[PDB]
Amino acid sequence: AYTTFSQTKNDQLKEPMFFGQPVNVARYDQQKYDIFEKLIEKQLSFFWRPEEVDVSRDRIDYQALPEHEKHIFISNLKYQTLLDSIQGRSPNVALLPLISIPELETWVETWAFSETIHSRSYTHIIRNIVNDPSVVFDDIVTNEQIQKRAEGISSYYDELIEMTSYWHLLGEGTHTVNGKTVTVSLRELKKKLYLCLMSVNALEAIRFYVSFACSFAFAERELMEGNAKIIRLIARDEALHLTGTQHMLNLLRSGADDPEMAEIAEECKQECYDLFVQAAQQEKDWADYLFRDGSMIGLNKDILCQYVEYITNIRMQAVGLDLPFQTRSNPIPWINTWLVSDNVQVAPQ
Amino acid sequence: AYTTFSQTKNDQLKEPMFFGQPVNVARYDQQKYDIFEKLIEKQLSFFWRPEEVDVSRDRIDYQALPEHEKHIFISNLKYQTLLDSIQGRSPNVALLPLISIPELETWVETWAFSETIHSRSYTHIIRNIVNDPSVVFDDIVTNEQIQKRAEGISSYYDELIEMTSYWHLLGEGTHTVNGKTVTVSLRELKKKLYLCLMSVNALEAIRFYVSFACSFAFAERELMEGNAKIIRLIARDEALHLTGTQHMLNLLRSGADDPEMAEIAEECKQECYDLFVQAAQQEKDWADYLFRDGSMIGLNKDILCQYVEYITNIRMQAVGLDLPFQTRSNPIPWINTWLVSDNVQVAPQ
C-alpha cells in the first residue's frame, strides 16, 4: 500500500515522522520539525566535489610509509568505503517508504546523496595512491574483519526493509504465506525502525569518528594531507547526519511525535544500550586489527580505544542512554583542530 | 723492552711510524708526517662537551615512539656505545707501545680521548631518555647481536696487544714457555697491526656511518633532535679518526715508511679485502635486526643496506682495495646535510 503520490489531501503538519500517509506534495513553505529543513539547507551549503582536492602528494607519502603504516591507512580507508557504500543507498531504500512528512523525506534524500559524494571521494583517493584499485575494492568485500562489521550493520537495514515490504503488501495482522504464519505488526515494525536508527546513529556518530582519528593522526605527522582535507569535509557532513538521527530518535522517544513510539523506545531501551556498547567494542577490536603489526607516532591501540570510550559516552547521553564507560577527558584533544567548522559544531561537546 | 723514556738520542724524523725506538722527548716543532700534527690541531679545535647539548625533548619523543621505533633507536644507541667503549681504550692500549714518532703518539692519545667524550655523550643521552639506564648498559654486554660484533672487533685489538707483549718481553725468535713453542716474529706482528688498523678503519669509516644514518633518519622526521646534534659533533670527529687510519694504512703499504710493510700489505691484501666485506655484511645483518619488527619513514632494511654498499665501496678505494659491490649512487643524499663541517669534509666523497 505504498503510493508515490497519495491522493488524500492531508495536513502534513499533523502527520507523524513515520508510518503516516506517504508524502504527496513536496512543499517547503512550512514544516512540522524545522530541524530537518535546517539540515537540508546546511548540507546544501556544504556541497563539495572530491576532485577539488589535490591528493597527488598522498601517493608519495603512501609509498614511503612502512608496511604496517600502509596497513593502518588502507584498512581505515577500506572501512570508510564500506560504511558509506552502505550509507549511500540504505537511508533511501529503508527510510523513504516509511516517511510521512515532506521535510524529513527530502532530508533523507539529501543525506543519502551527500554520502554518494563521500563514496566518490574515497574512489578519488584510492585511484591516486595505489596502482591497482581493484585489489582494494575487492578486499572490502572479502576481508574477514570488515565483513563482520558489514553484516551486523546491514542487517538492521535489511530487516527493516523486509518487514516494511510485508507491511505494505499484507497490512497489519496474522497472515498465511505458502503455508507459513506471517504476523505483521506495526508495533514491531516501529521497533525495527527505532533500533535501525540507533544503529545508524552509532555508525555515524561513533564508528566514523574513530576513523577520523586514524586519518587526522597521519595529518598530524604531516602525511596523507590530501586525504585529510577530504576527511575534514566528510566530517563536517557527518556532524549534520548524526544530528539528524539524534533528532529523529529523541523526537520518537519523547512521545511528542508518536505516543506509541515512546513506549516502544522504553521497551527496547536496554537493547539500544546493548547495541551501542557492542558497536563500541567492535571498534575497539578494530583498533586491535589496525595496530596488529605495530603502531605509529601519536596513535596506537590504547589511545584509540580510549577515544572510542570518550566518544561513545558523549553520543549515548545525546540519545538518552546510560553511559557505559568511565567518565574520561579527551585522550586526543588535537583531533578538535580537524573536527571544526564555522557553520556547524563538528567536534563532539 | 718497552721503555717510557728511551735513552738513545735518535732522529725522530727518520724513525718508522711503528716498531722503531719508543718515543722519548715529546716535541712538536717538527714531524715526519705533518698530517698527524694537523689532525691533533683539528681535533683540539673541535673539542666539545656533551652537556652543551640539551637532550630534554628527546625523552618525550622517545616515549611517544612506537615499540619497534624504540627498538630501532635504542639498538643503534647501544651499538654506538659498544663501539666507542672499545675505541675509548683500545687505540691507547694497542698502539701506544708500538709508536716511534711523537706526532703519531700524541695523535693516538688525542684520538682516544675524543672517544671517551663520545662515550660520555651516550651516557648523557641514555640518562635523559630512559628511566633505568642500567637495563640499557647491561644489554650492551649480553645482547646476542651486539656481542657478536664486539668479539670480532675486539679480537683484532686483543691479538695485537698480546703479540706486542711477547715481542717486548721475549724479542724476536723462537722461544720456550712452560714447555711450549712460542715464535715471536716482527713480520707477523707487523701483519697483526696492519690487519687491526684495517679493522679499525672499517669500524670508524663504515660501521659508525651506518649508525649515523639511523640517527639522522629520526632527525629527518624531526624526532630525537638532541641526539642528532650530538651525532653531528661525533660525526665530525669520526671524519678525523678515519682520516688518521687511512693515512697510517696508505703510508704503510706504499713502502715509504717501511719497505717491509709494503710486502706484508700486499701479502694480506686479500685478507684485508675479506675483512672489509665481512664487516659490510655484518652491518647488513644488523639492518635486519634493527628493522625486524618494522621500519619507519625514510629508512628501512633495503635502504640502509644500499647505504652500506655505497659507503663501503668509497672507504675501500681510499685504502687501495678492490670495490666489492656494484657502483651505485648515494641512496640517501639527505644524510649529507648532517654530515657536514666547514673545517673538515665529514661526508664521504
PDB file of N, CA, C and O in Angstrom, chain A residues 225-272:
ATOM      1  N   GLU A 225      48.043  14.310   3.617  1.00  0.00           N
ATOM      2  CA  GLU A 225      47.353  15.564   3.883  1.00  0.00           C
ATOM      3  C   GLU A 225      46.190  15.809   2.926  1.00  0.00           C
ATOM      4  O   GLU A 225      45.217  16.465   3.292  1.00  0.00           O
ATOM      5  N   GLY A 226      46.284  15.280   1.709  1.00  0.00           N
ATOM      6  CA  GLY A 226      45.188  15.392   0.759  1.00  0.00           C
ATOM      7  C   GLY A 226      43.978  14.648   1.287  1.00  0.00           C
ATOM      8  O   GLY A 226      42.871  15.191   1.371  1.00  0.00           O
ATOM      9  N   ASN A 227      44.203  13.393   1.661  1.00  0.00           N
ATOM     10  CA  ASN A 227      43.185  12.595   2.328  1.00  0.00           C
ATOM     11  C   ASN A 227      42.549  13.328   3.510  1.00  0.00           C
ATOM     12  O   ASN A 227      41.337  13.260   3.706  1.00  0.00           O
ATOM     13  N   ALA A 228      43.364  14.043   4.284  1.00  0.00           N
ATOM     14  CA  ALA A 228      42.865  14.737   5.478  1.00  0.00           C
ATOM     15  C   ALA A 228      41.934  15.899   5.125  1.00  0.00           C
ATOM     16  O   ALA A 228      40.929  16.123   5.805  1.00  0.00           O
ATOM     17  N   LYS A 229      42.268  16.635   4.066  1.00  0.00           N
ATOM     18  CA  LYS A 229      41.399  17.710   3.586  1.00  0.00           C
ATOM     19  C   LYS A 229      40.015  17.177   3.221  1.00  0.00           C
ATOM     20  O   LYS A 229      39.002  17.835   3.468  1.00  0.00           O
ATOM     21  N   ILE A 230      39.972  15.976   2.651  1.00  0.00           N
ATOM     22  CA  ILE A 230      38.701  15.359   2.280  1.00  0.00           C
ATOM     23  C   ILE A 230      37.950  14.864   3.506  1.00  0.00           C
ATOM     24  O   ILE A 230      36.741  15.077   3.628  1.00  0.00           O
ATOM     25  N   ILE A 231      38.662  14.218   4.425  1.00  0.00           N
ATOM     26  CA  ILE A 231      38.036  13.783   5.665  1.00  0.00           C
ATOM     27  C   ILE A 231      37.445  14.980   6.426  1.00  0.00           C
ATOM     28  O   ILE A 231      36.360  14.871   6.995  1.00  0.00           O
ATOM     29  N   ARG A 232      38.130  16.124   6.412  1.00  0.00           N
ATOM     30  CA  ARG A 232      37.593  17.332   7.060  1.00  0.00           C
ATOM     31  C   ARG A 232      36.220  17.713   6.498  1.00  0.00           C
ATOM     32  O   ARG A 232      35.306  18.073   7.249  1.00  0.00           O
ATOM     33  N   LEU A 233      36.078  17.628   5.175  1.00  0.00           N
ATOM     34  CA  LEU A 233      34.803  17.924   4.525  1.00  0.00           C
ATOM     35  C   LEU A 233      33.766  16.853   4.852  1.00  0.00           C
ATOM     36  O   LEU A 233      32.602  17.160   5.116  1.00  0.00           O
ATOM     37  N   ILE A 234      34.198  15.596   4.828  1.00  0.00           N
ATOM     38  CA  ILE A 234      33.344  14.472   5.201  1.00  0.00           C
ATOM     39  C   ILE A 234      32.881  14.581   6.659  1.00  0.00           C
ATOM     40  O   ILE A 234      31.706  14.349   6.967  1.00  0.00           O
ATOM     41  N   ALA A 235      33.798  14.955   7.549  1.00  0.00           N
ATOM     42  CA  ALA A 235      33.472  15.080   8.972  1.00  0.00           C
ATOM     43  C   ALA A 235      32.403  16.146   9.204  1.00  0.00           C
ATOM     44  O   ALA A 235      31.487  15.956  10.001  1.00  0.00           O
ATOM     45  N   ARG A 236      32.516  17.260   8.488  1.00  0.00           N
ATOM     46  CA  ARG A 236      31.521  18.329   8.568  1.00  0.00           C
ATOM     47  C   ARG A 236      30.126  17.849   8.137  1.00  0.00           C
ATOM     48  O   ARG A 236      29.125  18.212   8.757  1.00  0.00           O
ATOM     49  N   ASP A 237      30.056  17.037   7.081  1.00  0.00           N
ATOM     50  CA  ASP A 237      28.776  16.444   6.683  1.00  0.00           C
ATOM     51  C   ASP A 237      28.266  15.492   7.753  1.00  0.00           C
ATOM     52  O   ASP A 237      27.071  15.451   8.054  1.00  0.00           O
ATOM     53  N   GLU A 238      29.179  14.702   8.303  1.00  0.00           N
ATOM     54  CA  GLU A 238      28.806  13.669   9.248  1.00  0.00           C
ATOM     55  C   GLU A 238      28.155  14.278  10.484  1.00  0.00           C
ATOM     56  O   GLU A 238      27.256  13.683  11.074  1.00  0.00           O
ATOM     57  N   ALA A 239      28.598  15.476  10.856  1.00  0.00           N
ATOM     58  CA  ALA A 239      28.029  16.171  12.004  1.00  0.00           C
ATOM     59  C   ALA A 239      26.559  16.503  11.759  1.00  0.00           C
ATOM     60  O   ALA A 239      25.757  16.517  12.694  1.00  0.00           O
ATOM     61  N   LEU A 240      26.209  16.767  10.499  1.00  0.00           N
ATOM     62  CA  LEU A 240      24.816  17.010  10.137  1.00  0.00           C
ATOM     63  C   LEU A 240      24.017  15.720  10.193  1.00  0.00           C
ATOM     64  O   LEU A 240      22.893  15.696  10.686  1.00  0.00           O
ATOM     65  N   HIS A 241      24.598  14.652   9.660  1.00  0.00           N
ATOM     66  CA  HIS A 241      23.909  13.373   9.596  1.00  0.00           C
ATOM     67  C   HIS A 241      23.547  12.873  10.983  1.00  0.00           C
ATOM     68  O   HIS A 241      22.398  12.507  11.230  1.00  0.00           O
ATOM     69  N   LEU A 242      24.522  12.866  11.892  1.00  0.00           N
ATOM     70  CA  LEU A 242      24.279  12.348  13.229  1.00  0.00           C
ATOM     71  C   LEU A 242      23.312  13.270  13.961  1.00  0.00           C
ATOM     72  O   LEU A 242      22.519  12.810  14.778  1.00  0.00           O
ATOM     73  N   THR A 243      23.355  14.566  13.654  1.00  0.00           N
ATOM     74  CA  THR A 243      22.401  15.497  14.249  1.00  0.00           C
ATOM     75  C   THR A 243      20.993  15.110  13.822  1.00  0.00           C
ATOM     76  O   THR A 243      20.053  15.160  14.619  1.00  0.00           O
ATOM     77  N   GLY A 244      20.862  14.719  12.557  1.00  0.00           N
ATOM     78  CA  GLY A 244      19.588  14.278  12.022  1.00  0.00           C
ATOM     79  C   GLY A 244      19.031  13.073  12.753  1.00  0.00           C
ATOM     80  O   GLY A 244      17.874  13.074  13.173  1.00  0.00           O
ATOM     81  N   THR A 245      19.852  12.040  12.915  1.00  0.00           N
ATOM     82  CA  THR A 245      19.395  10.826  13.580  1.00  0.00           C
ATOM     83  C   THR A 245      19.177  11.064  15.076  1.00  0.00           C
ATOM     84  O   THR A 245      18.328  10.420  15.688  1.00  0.00           O
ATOM     85  N   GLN A 246      19.916  11.999  15.664  1.00  0.00           N
ATOM     86  CA  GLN A 246      19.713  12.314  17.078  1.00  0.00           C
ATOM     87  C   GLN A 246      18.347  12.952  17.299  1.00  0.00           C
ATOM     88  O   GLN A 246      17.687  12.702  18.313  1.00  0.00           O
ATOM     89  N   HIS A 247      17.917  13.782  16.355  1.00  0.00           N
ATOM     90  CA  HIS A 247      16.613  14.422  16.488  1.00  0.00           C
ATOM     91  C   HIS A 247      15.486  13.439  16.202  1.00  0.00           C
ATOM     92  O   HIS A 247      14.460  13.464  16.881  1.00  0.00           O
ATOM     93  N   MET A 248      15.680  12.564  15.216  1.00  0.00           N
ATOM     94  CA  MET A 248      14.693  11.522  14.928  1.00  0.00           C
ATOM     95  C   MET A 248      14.466  10.654  16.165  1.00  0.00           C
ATOM     96  O   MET A 248      13.335  10.474  16.614  1.00  0.00           O
ATOM     97  N   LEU A 249      15.555  10.129  16.714  1.00  0.00           N
ATOM     98  CA  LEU A 249      15.489   9.270  17.888  1.00  0.00           C
ATOM     99  C   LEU A 249      14.855   9.984  19.085  1.00  0.00           C
ATOM    100  O   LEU A 249      13.931   9.459  19.704  1.00  0.00           O
ATOM    101  N   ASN A 250      15.328  11.189  19.396  1.00  0.00           N
ATOM    102  CA  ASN A 250      14.795  11.931  20.536  1.00  0.00           C
ATOM    103  C   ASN A 250      13.334  12.327  20.362  1.00  0.00           C
ATOM    104  O   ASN A 250      12.566  12.290  21.323  1.00  0.00           O
ATOM    105  N   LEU A 251      12.944  12.707  19.145  1.00  0.00           N
ATOM    106  CA  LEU A 251      11.547  13.050  18.885  1.00  0.00           C
ATOM    107  C   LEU A 251      10.653  11.817  18.990  1.00  0.00           C
ATOM    108  O   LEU A 251       9.484  11.922  19.353  1.00  0.00           O
ATOM    109  N   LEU A 252      11.208  10.650  18.682  1.00  0.00           N
ATOM    110  CA  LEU A 252      10.446   9.411  18.748  1.00  0.00           C
ATOM    111  C   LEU A 252      10.207   8.967  20.190  1.00  0.00           C
ATOM    112  O   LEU A 252       9.099   8.570  20.542  1.00  0.00           O
ATOM    113  N   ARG A 253      11.239   9.040  21.026  1.00  0.00           N
ATOM    114  CA  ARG A 253      11.139   8.509  22.382  1.00  0.00           C
ATOM    115  C   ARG A 253      10.452   9.478  23.341  1.00  0.00           C
ATOM    116  O   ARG A 253       9.993   9.073  24.402  1.00  0.00           O
ATOM    117  N   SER A 254      10.370  10.748  22.964  1.00  0.00           N
ATOM    118  CA  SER A 254       9.681  11.740  23.786  1.00  0.00           C
ATOM    119  C   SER A 254       8.170  11.518  23.786  1.00  0.00           C
ATOM    120  O   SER A 254       7.491  11.851  24.757  1.00  0.00           O
ATOM    121  N   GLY A 255       7.648  10.966  22.694  1.00  0.00           N
ATOM    122  CA  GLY A 255       6.226  10.695  22.576  1.00  0.00           C
ATOM    123  C   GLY A 255       5.460  11.854  21.971  1.00  0.00           C
ATOM    124  O   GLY A 255       4.246  11.779  21.777  1.00  0.00           O
ATOM    125  N   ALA A 256       6.179  12.931  21.669  1.00  0.00           N
ATOM    126  CA  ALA A 256       5.585  14.137  21.103  1.00  0.00           C
ATOM    127  C   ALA A 256       5.119  13.910  19.669  1.00  0.00           C
ATOM    128  O   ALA A 256       4.144  14.507  19.217  1.00  0.00           O
ATOM    129  N   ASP A 257       5.828  13.043  18.958  1.00  0.00           N
ATOM    130  CA  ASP A 257       5.507  12.746  17.571  1.00  0.00           C
ATOM    131  C   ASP A 257       4.546  11.572  17.473  1.00  0.00           C
ATOM    132  O   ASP A 257       3.581  11.598  16.710  1.00  0.00           O
ATOM    133  N   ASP A 258       4.830  10.539  18.256  1.00  0.00           N
ATOM    134  CA  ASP A 258       4.008   9.339  18.294  1.00  0.00           C
ATOM    135  C   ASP A 258       4.084   8.697  19.681  1.00  0.00           C
ATOM    136  O   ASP A 258       5.112   8.127  20.054  1.00  0.00           O
ATOM    137  N   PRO A 259       2.992   8.792  20.452  1.00  0.00           N
ATOM    138  CA  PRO A 259       2.956   8.289  21.830  1.00  0.00           C
ATOM    139  C   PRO A 259       3.289   6.800  21.932  1.00  0.00           C
ATOM    140  O   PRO A 259       3.830   6.361  22.947  1.00  0.00           O
ATOM    141  N   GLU A 260       2.970   6.042  20.888  1.00  0.00           N
ATOM    142  CA  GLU A 260       3.246   4.611  20.872  1.00  0.00           C
ATOM    143  C   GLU A 260       4.739   4.360  20.783  1.00  0.00           C
ATOM    144  O   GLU A 260       5.257   3.410  21.366  1.00  0.00           O
ATOM    145  N   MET A 261       5.427   5.225  20.045  1.00  0.00           N
ATOM    146  CA  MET A 261       6.868   5.116  19.884  1.00  0.00           C
ATOM    147  C   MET A 261       7.600   5.334  21.199  1.00  0.00           C
ATOM    148  O   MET A 261       8.661   4.754  21.425  1.00  0.00           O
ATOM    149  N   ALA A 262       7.032   6.175  22.056  1.00  0.00           N
ATOM    150  CA  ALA A 262       7.611   6.435  23.368  1.00  0.00           C
ATOM    151  C   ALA A 262       7.680   5.149  24.180  1.00  0.00           C
ATOM    152  O   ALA A 262       8.703   4.846  24.793  1.00  0.00           O
ATOM    153  N   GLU A 263       6.586   4.394  24.167  1.00  0.00           N
ATOM    154  CA  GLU A 263       6.503   3.126  24.879  1.00  0.00           C
ATOM    155  C   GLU A 263       7.496   2.114  24.322  1.00  0.00           C
ATOM    156  O   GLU A 263       8.234   1.477  25.074  1.00  0.00           O
ATOM    157  N   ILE A 264       7.504   1.974  23.000  1.00  0.00           N
ATOM    158  CA  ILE A 264       8.400   1.048  22.315  1.00  0.00           C
ATOM    159  C   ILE A 264       9.861   1.383  22.587  1.00  0.00           C
ATOM    160  O   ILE A 264      10.692   0.492  22.742  1.00  0.00           O
ATOM    161  N   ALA A 265      10.164   2.673  22.653  1.00  0.00           N
ATOM    162  CA  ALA A 265      11.525   3.124  22.909  1.00  0.00           C
ATOM    163  C   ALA A 265      11.965   2.730  24.314  1.00  0.00           C
ATOM    164  O   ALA A 265      13.104   2.319  24.530  1.00  0.00           O
ATOM    165  N   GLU A 266      11.052   2.855  25.269  1.00  0.00           N
ATOM    166  CA  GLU A 266      11.352   2.474  26.641  1.00  0.00           C
ATOM    167  C   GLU A 266      11.498   0.959  26.759  1.00  0.00           C
ATOM    168  O   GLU A 266      12.321   0.470  27.530  1.00  0.00           O
ATOM    169  N   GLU A 267      10.709   0.222  25.983  1.00  0.00           N
ATOM    170  CA  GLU A 267      10.784  -1.236  25.974  1.00  0.00           C
ATOM    171  C   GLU A 267      12.153  -1.744  25.533  1.00  0.00           C
ATOM    172  O   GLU A 267      12.727  -2.623  26.172  1.00  0.00           O
ATOM    173  N   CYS A 268      12.674  -1.199  24.439  1.00  0.00           N
ATOM    174  CA  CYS A 268      13.947  -1.674  23.912  1.00  0.00           C
ATOM    175  C   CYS A 268      15.103  -0.746  24.289  1.00  0.00           C
ATOM    176  O   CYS A 268      16.121  -0.695  23.597  1.00  0.00           O
ATOM    177  N   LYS A 269      14.947  -0.028  25.398  1.00  0.00           N
ATOM    178  CA  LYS A 269      15.982   0.889  25.870  1.00  0.00           C
ATOM    179  C   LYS A 269      17.242   0.135  26.272  1.00  0.00           C
ATOM    180  O   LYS A 269      18.353   0.640  26.123  1.00  0.00           O
ATOM    181  N   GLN A 270      17.064  -1.077  26.785  1.00  0.00           N
ATOM    182  CA  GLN A 270      18.193  -1.942  27.102  1.00  0.00           C
ATOM    183  C   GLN A 270      18.877  -2.399  25.823  1.00  0.00           C
ATOM    184  O   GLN A 270      20.102  -2.384  25.714  1.00  0.00           O
ATOM    185  N   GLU A 271      18.061  -2.812  24.860  1.00  0.00           N
ATOM    186  CA  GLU A 271      18.545  -3.301  23.579  1.00  0.00           C
ATOM    187  C   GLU A 271      19.383  -2.246  22.866  1.00  0.00           C
ATOM    188  O   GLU A 271      20.416  -2.557  22.271  1.00  0.00           O
ATOM    189  N   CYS A 272      18.935  -0.995  22.932  1.00  0.00           N
ATOM    190  CA  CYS A 272      19.663   0.103  22.305  1.00  0.00           C
ATOM    191  C   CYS A 272      20.975   0.342  23.025  1.00  0.00           C
ATOM    192  O   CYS A 272      21.996   0.648  22.406  1.00  0.00           O
TER     193      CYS A 272
END
